[PDB]
């Protein structure tokens, strides 16, 4: 009882710590599987904000009176 009083820990304490860490890493595994799903479908489709390689910016494309009337 002296050992259990000054040295060891409560089984309720250890038990709830295990419950809490299982909750944490369950959320981590769910988010990781969701991450790989999102990445593969976004590379397949292209709608999402990630894999947008830089295309043309239309700042220099201008409408103006040219020389040749066919432009």
């Amino acid at each position: 009882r002296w050992i259990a009083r000054t040295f060891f820990d409560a089984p309720e304490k250890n038990y709830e710590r295990t419950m809490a860490i299982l909750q944490i890493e369950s959320e981590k595994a769910e988010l990781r599987l969701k991450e790989l799903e999102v990445r593969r479908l976004m590379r397949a489709k292209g709608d999402g904000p990630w894999f947008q390689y830089p295309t043309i910016d239309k700042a220099l494309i201008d409408h103006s009176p040219k020389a040749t009337p066919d432009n």
């Binding site: 959320e27 981590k28 988010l31 990781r32 904000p49």
Partner: protein, 57 residues
Amino acid sequence: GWVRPDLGELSKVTKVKTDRPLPENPYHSRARPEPNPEVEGDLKPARHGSRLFFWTM
């Protein structure tokens, strides 16, 4: 008559009227393909850290 046009009178960009209004898209252009759905809004902090193999928080 016909006073000869001096320089620079054959210049000086000029307004004039027509009968038709100016038409849209003389470039026979289709509509826009797609808009980009704007990913905006304020950001939360890092959910459970890096979510790597470890290095949590």
